[PDB]
Design brief:
Layout lengths: L2 E6 L5 H10 L3 E4 H6 L7 H10 L5 E2 L2 E2 L1 H6 L5 H15 L3 H7 L6 E4 L14 E5 L3 H10 L4 H8 L5 H4 L5 E2 L6 H13 L4
Parallel strand pairs: 1-5, 1-6, 2-5, 6-7
Antiparallel strand pairs: 3-4
Helix pairs in contact: 3-5
Length: 194
Amino acid sequence: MKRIGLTGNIGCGKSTVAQMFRELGAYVLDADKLIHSFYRKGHPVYEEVVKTFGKGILDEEGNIDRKKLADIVFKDEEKLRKLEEITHRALYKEIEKITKNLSEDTLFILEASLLVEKGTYKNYDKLIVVYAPYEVCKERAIKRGMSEEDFERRWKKQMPIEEKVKYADYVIDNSGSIEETYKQVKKVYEELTR
């Protein structure tokens, strides 16, 4: 099977596209969504993140303070490197677990919105990016509720979408309408299962 990557910026429609693609038959796995489940509790990732960063330093009665950790990790990039490791050590250890039962010739896509800057797109055959102007993305996260500063706080991290577009061999612009966005993915899905 061909490992496909679906990326973009926050509020670009990666979700809606990931969905359309699933309807078409593709198997889209939200990497980011999955990761967040690692910091829950009984999760094996949890036991490691605490085991290596502090049985309690980053704890708040029961679970882990996503702020305390992100704090003691913004000082020395040595700890972050270790954090980014445990993560992928769980992602690429769970991806093959799913690929196990996954029938062949199946269209397996992975959306993380951070396959470019994190330099991971090289781990997948082709890359798909969803374009959308800062204007549309902002109000998009707005109408969905996320607070202006919070949005801009993340958008800052992600590289200029107008530059990211120059990283994928497929760009399903999601600024126009829904009819167009879906009409595009459909074209792409055809260009992947030929």
